[PDB]
Design an enzyme around this catalytic site. Structure first.
Site, short mmCIF file in Angstrom:
data_model
loop_
_atom_site.label_atom_id
_atom_site.label_comp_id
_atom_site.label_asym_id
_atom_site.label_seq_id
_atom_site.Cartn_x
_atom_site.Cartn_y
_atom_site.Cartn_z
N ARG A 104 0.80 -1.22 0.00
CA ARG A 104 0.00 0.00 0.00
C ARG A 104 0.84 1.28 0.00
O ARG A 104 0.40 2.29 -0.55
CB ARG A 104 -1.01 0.03 1.15
CG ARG A 104 -2.10 1.07 0.91
CD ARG A 104 -3.06 1.16 2.07
NE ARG A 104 -3.95 0.01 2.16
CZ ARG A 104 -4.39 -0.52 3.30
NH1 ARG A 104 -3.99 -0.05 4.49
NH2 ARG A 104 -5.21 -1.58 3.26
N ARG A 130 12.50 -5.65 6.60
CA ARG A 130 11.46 -6.55 7.08
C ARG A 130 10.13 -6.11 6.44
O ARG A 130 10.11 -5.89 5.23
CB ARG A 130 11.43 -6.57 8.62
CG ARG A 130 12.70 -7.11 9.27
CD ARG A 130 12.60 -7.03 10.78
NE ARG A 130 13.61 -7.82 11.48
CZ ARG A 130 13.48 -9.08 11.90
NH1 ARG A 130 12.36 -9.78 11.66
NH2 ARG A 130 14.49 -9.67 12.53
N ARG A 172 -3.32 6.30 10.94
CA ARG A 172 -3.39 4.97 10.36
C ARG A 172 -4.47 4.92 9.29
O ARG A 172 -5.64 5.23 9.57
CB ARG A 172 -3.67 3.91 11.44
CG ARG A 172 -4.03 2.54 10.89
CD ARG A 172 -3.96 1.41 11.93
NE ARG A 172 -4.90 0.34 11.57
CZ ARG A 172 -4.78 -0.47 10.52
NH1 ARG A 172 -3.74 -0.38 9.69
NH2 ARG A 172 -5.73 -1.37 10.26
N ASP A 231 -13.70 -4.24 4.14
CA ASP A 231 -13.66 -5.27 3.06
C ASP A 231 -14.43 -6.57 3.35
O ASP A 231 -14.66 -7.36 2.43
CB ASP A 231 -12.20 -5.57 2.64
CG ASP A 231 -11.35 -6.17 3.75
OD1 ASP A 231 -11.88 -6.71 4.74
OD2 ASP A 231 -10.11 -6.11 3.62
N1 LIG Z 1 -9.32 -8.37 13.29
C1 LIG Z 1 -9.64 -8.25 11.96
N2 LIG Z 1 -9.02 -7.30 11.20
C2 LIG Z 1 -9.36 -7.19 9.89
C3 LIG Z 1 -8.89 -6.30 8.80
C4 LIG Z 1 -7.90 -5.17 8.83
N3 LIG Z 1 -6.45 -5.38 8.71
C5 LIG Z 1 -6.04 -6.33 7.65
C6 LIG Z 1 -4.85 -7.10 8.23
C7 LIG Z 1 -5.18 -8.59 8.34
O1 LIG Z 1 -5.63 -9.07 7.06
C8 LIG Z 1 -4.54 -6.48 9.59
O2 LIG Z 1 -3.42 -5.59 9.52
C9 LIG Z 1 -5.82 -5.75 9.99
C10 LIG Z 1 -9.63 -6.68 7.67
N4 LIG Z 1 -10.47 -7.71 7.96
C11 LIG Z 1 -10.36 -8.07 9.26
C12 LIG Z 1 -10.97 -9.07 10.16
O3 LIG Z 1 -11.83 -9.87 9.73
N5 LIG Z 1 -10.58 -9.10 11.45
N1 LIG Z 2 11.35 -9.33 22.75
C1 LIG Z 2 12.57 -9.23 22.14
N2 LIG Z 2 12.83 -9.97 21.02
C2 LIG Z 2 14.05 -9.87 20.43
C3 LIG Z 2 14.64 -10.50 19.22
C4 LIG Z 2 14.07 -11.53 18.28
N3 LIG Z 2 13.20 -11.18 17.15
C5 LIG Z 2 13.64 -10.02 16.35
C6 LIG Z 2 12.37 -9.27 15.96
C7 LIG Z 2 12.38 -7.86 16.55
O1 LIG Z 2 13.60 -7.20 16.17
C8 LIG Z 2 11.20 -10.10 16.47
O2 LIG Z 2 10.60 -10.87 15.41
C9 LIG Z 2 11.79 -11.00 17.55
C10 LIG Z 2 15.94 -9.98 19.14
N4 LIG Z 2 16.18 -9.10 20.14
C11 LIG Z 2 15.10 -8.98 20.94
C12 LIG Z 2 14.73 -8.22 22.15
O3 LIG Z 2 15.54 -7.43 22.68
N5 LIG Z 2 13.50 -8.39 22.68
#
Ligand SMILES: Nc1nc2c(CN3C[C@H](CO)[C@@H](O)C3)c[nH]c2c(=O)[nH]1
Ligand SMILES: Nc1nc2c(CN3C[C@H](CO)[C@@H](O)C3)c[nH]c2c(=O)[nH]1
Ligand SMILES: Nc1nc2c(CN3C[C@H](CO)[C@@H](O)C3)c[nH]c2c(=O)[nH]1
Ligand SMILES: Nc1nc2c(CN3C[C@H](CO)[C@@H](O)C3)c[nH]c2c(=O)[nH]1
Ligand SMILES: Nc1nc2c(CN3C[C@H](CO)[C@@H](O)C3)c[nH]c2c(=O)[nH]1
Ligand SMILES: Nc1nc2c(CN3C[C@H](CO)[C@@H](O)C3)c[nH]c2c(=O)[nH]1
Lengths: 230, 230, 230, 230, 230, 230
Positions: free
Chosen positions: D25, D43, D86, D204
């Site tokens: 998006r 990521r 958002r 949606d």
């Molecule tokens: N909890 C929830 N969130 C969403 C969303 C909204 N976002 C879409 C994405 C998961 O597909 C998330 O970042 C939240 C669309 N449909 C739904 C639903 O059925 N449930």
């Molecule tokens: N909770 C936590 N997770 C992590 C991780 C492990 N993953 C790395 C990523 C966030 O950088 C997540 O998917 C978890 C590395 N360092 C840390 C930390 O300091 N804290």
């Protein structure tokens, strides 16, 4: 038809039951009575029919801790018990006032268990029956034995650790008198099952003469209450 | 030095205090006494010094609900009150047994509030003082007024809604007798502040003659307890 | 057909209602209006029909605390109220910024009550209606009265104790502006019952001229909102 | 000095930031702007500097779900962001009213996450900034795009299972409008970090033309808010 | 019939799946294999079919955090996956012992998420499959790579704040080895859906050679487990 | 220097300890060994030194329920025990699969107690040591005894009531295998105290030949583990 853990029948259950933690204490108590009949001994649950001042009532051990004593109490409450008094030991939460050897007759308890909460919401009070409490206090009075009264903290944790702080100091500040491990569970089960409950406790930490007194009070109360059902 | 909400001074607080929800009930009660002195009326908190059977004690309204009554109770408990009895109304949780107009003297309560929990952990019991309870029952007895005894559900929700189920039916199954909105809060505050508490309640839902009786019991109990401090 | 606690009928309920804690404040407010009609006074709930800038709206007292005000709000919301604004007092949680006498118009609240939680899960927000909030801010603006905006901590505990720490400092660090005892309850009930809510508050702790201003803002907002339903 | 997850520097962070879940998006949005500069992609976090109606603001993807978006929001909030909106998708909780393709501008959210609760007590509201909300509604108005307003359920559970019932129906009965997975987290972090937040969502489930409209509203709002800091 | 978030079909799902957080790591892993087929890349979810030591298994990215990875895991578990191993990074909770670059193979996790709790009560353990754990340890052994074993704290909070204390130190005292953000969620979903799970993690805070080793262990384990279903 | 409840000294504690609920089972086990030495019997805690396949290890009863067994486990763990295996009975939560007389070797447990929660936060897993689990499975294998593996629900409620529904059916749906009352407590205490734990259980509800087999497995495992410390 024998109870699963106590291994006695419904017919052997008397209206009044004296409960203690240690099966050893059941043997020390039964010899103070006028006579007795050994009924059963299974796991930690020792059951004896006591004969005292013309009345008949059971003395049964419940073991250490809430989950194990709940098994005992449910078996008693669902098979005819009407009155259950716990005679136990405890620690003092008011060390300046309530000393080693002192006796406390408790009206209510802190539910720091799990089983009571699996039976009823936490907001529900663990409270003893007033008549049982009154009877215990009046036996102490006529035997000229000084007693304290107050709330017991019933906790499932005997040995604290250093990650999650113990709530004992909080409860001491809240004016709880003593701490042990079973009374709250007894009280809640009793209320739910329409059984009248109470508790008398002897402090050992934070005299066998005082134990003797405590036992006489408990036996005296049991006989008095037993007369209402005989 | 005037209390913030009650607008009376520490000097005007008597050892025994009778509390009610409705400031209107304070006016109905004061005229039953031998004489009275109107002290203050601020917000929902009306305070009157009652004179009855040779004794002096306050009658104070606390309003509807736990947070508002806690303000009243804290002001009383922290400025010299030794005994607080709540005389209130309630609903029945045992409709086959406890009927409209019946009177219930309560020994303990369900803490379905928030303020008690902001003071002490939920596992702590809301329990009344035994002597206060005994005194109330003995006044009822000598006036030949039948009463019930039991636990009250003190709930912050008068009007349930249909999303989160009410726990009242659960508590009825658990053998709670009646429901109202303040007693648990009184009991917990009293325990924490070393003030002796009790509760007597008249059922109106789920007779002004019975109200009269209930008031006489409460006034009788207050005078009896007041003699211990005079 | 009279409401149980307010003792007014559904027909007497206007689309817009101004609520305050102290029945005394209802009397101070009604005399600021162009005219008024005293409707009822039962327990802590005083109800008056206010006439201001060509519009008609009730002013009703709700008492101290969440459980008692919920009774008021439910009676209003279930019998035709469309808009409820709370005009109250509060303490400051940002003492360097928000001072005694300052006015805060609040958009949301911390649910430190019980009744909201007996209605809906704790994760649900206590939030006011935007239009009500906007209207209040625009009345302040046209009267040239400086105001703050922010979140209120609505707590059931007026008087903290020293066992369970108060969360006020936490909420101050979280950027909550002020604290009082009822706004969260109003907001949640309003959302559940499709009633638009808001809150304007005057700080007295941690000037009657500022009270006057606050009242003019609240009355101005009520009249503006009342025009949408007339 | 590059942010750990976003891989942009503090200097690249603009006062206003538009956040979306899908890095895809961000690419669809940047081409709608007058020009853009791709900054980083690490990521699930894609960052682009957008140029629109004479103003400069970032568009950054936050990924699916609360714990992952919190990482994004904290990095933004602690390095200079003042306003975060958002722009997301959602399901409808009022299927008779709010239909597929409809747009909802949200003022508050249900905190069905964990991270908000690891930051601040559950009683604290997830609430958006009023000015951001007002700005979004006024852009929709001037573009003649119908919108809904209401509360979003932000849930960490996309796929329910059949052991623990989902609270969605409860929240629908409570008048929550829509559901998604991130807005509550944004709101709470923003409040704690003094960052103004808001949310606009397209339904949606339970039209790319409507997506286009929603994007124009969001971009319009960002530019308007950006002028206050330029 | 394409999975909603992964955008692959049920037919493309292999019995064994290797999951990682970063879609970038999927690309670094696939080139270590004997061959691969890029399948899909949608949002943060990158899917590749890996060919290694004669076996076929997917490598799929799950994103940062529990709610987002749950979406991935549910899609896999409900469409034929039998074994899911997470190969991730982590922090050390035992800094004197477990150092940067060390590898930990985890048998269980702390559920500091929300989604697991929306699926099953908190008392339920987050625990890995023993055979998966054994297989991972035996691959490390035959590659002569030293590893640690222990419990991971899976927390939804990457960035703590200073209002609610982090529980990490508590969990360090409780002998948790490492911390990350997804393993508990994987474990609980796997148990509920009858999918065997495991976790291998490389410490980066509190060497790409060690990453290489960790990847070889994970790929070795996947191939060994894949033979049981081929 | 004698342990408070076990009434044995630190010197009498072996590296490996076999624990059972019933003091009666200690006597049935000791006669299966090559020789034994009765050490102590206090309350429900019976302690015997077992001699088997050239190794020395204690067999100790822990009583019914979590609070009582925690006392036993803490005394063992804080005075030199390195490995504790629980050999117990259980009910089946998968009645179509796991039948009366079947044996289950458990890797983890549901913490439906209180004491574990008074030691460490609920999110922490109750998990056994892998090597202990592996050893138990390998002894079963070499004795050609079929076993199941899975999670145990450790509940403090033996006798459910009809107000609060039991979570057993939920946990059955979650794929928990069996239920008993102590294993979760053992596991959590072991983890906190760096003691390796495990559990082997025989189903009796929802054959003494199977008990014999189970005992041989447990004794075989204890001897194997004892060799690592001798
Ligand atoms: N909890 C929830 N969130 C969403 C969303 C909204 N976002 C879409 C994405 C998961 O597909 C998330 O970042 C939240 C669309 N449909 C739904 C639903 O059925 N449930
Ligand atoms: N909770 C936590 N997770 C992590 C991780 C492990 N993953 C790395 C990523 C966030 O950088 C997540 O998917 C978890 C590395 N360092 C840390 C930390 O300091 N804290
Ligand atoms: N919780 C607790 N209970 C007790 C008791 C009372 N009983 C003694 C026994 C444990 O030794 C339990 O059945 C409870 C004595 N001392 C203590 C103490 O320090 N703590
Ligand atoms: N919770 C509750 N309380 C009461 C009471 C008792 N008091 C009456 C008043 C509310 O009308 C409160 O102060 C409590 C009467 N009926 C009811 C009821 O149906 N419910
Ligand atoms: N919680 C709280 N509320 C207030 C208020 C506001 N209202 C005043 C009244 C109690 O005096 C309640 O209805 C709430 C003023 N000061 C304070 C305070 O210190 N604390
Ligand atoms: N919770 C539970 N435990 C068991 C057990 C196992 N142990 C047997 C003893 C109670 O009889 C406790 O120490 C636990 C057998 N059957 C059952 C049951 O139906 N329920």
């Amino acid at each position: 038809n024998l109870l699963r853990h106590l291994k006695i029948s419904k017919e052997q259950i008397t209206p009044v039951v004296l409960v203690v933690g240690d099966p050893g204490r059941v043997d020390k108590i039964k010899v103070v009575c006028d006579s007795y009949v050994d009924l059963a001994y299974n796991r930690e649950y020792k059951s004896v029919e006591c004969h005292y001042k013309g009345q008949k009532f059971l003395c049964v051990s419940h073991g250490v801790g809430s989950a194990g004593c709940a098994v005992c109490f449910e078996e008693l409450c669902q098979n005819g018990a009407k009155v259950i008094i716990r005679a136990g030991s405890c620690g003092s939460l008011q060390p300046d006032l309530i000393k080693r050897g002192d006796i406390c007759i408790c009206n209510a308890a802190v539910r720091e268990d799990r089983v009571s909460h699996l039976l009823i919401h936490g907001d529900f009070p663990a409270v003893g029956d007033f008549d049982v409490y009154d009877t215990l206090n009046k036996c102490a009075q006529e035997l000229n034995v000084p007693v304290f009264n107050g709330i017991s903290v019933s906790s499932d944790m005997y040995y604290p650790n250093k990650i999650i702080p113990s709530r004992l100091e909080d409860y001491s500040k809240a004016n709880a008198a003593v701490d042990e491990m079973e009374l709250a569970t007894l009280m809640v089960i009793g209320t739910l099952r329409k059984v009248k409950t109470g508790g008398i406790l002897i402090v050992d930490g934070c005299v066998p003469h005082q134990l003797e007194n405590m036992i006489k009070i408990a036996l005296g109360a049991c006989a008095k209450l037993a007369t209402k059902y005989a």
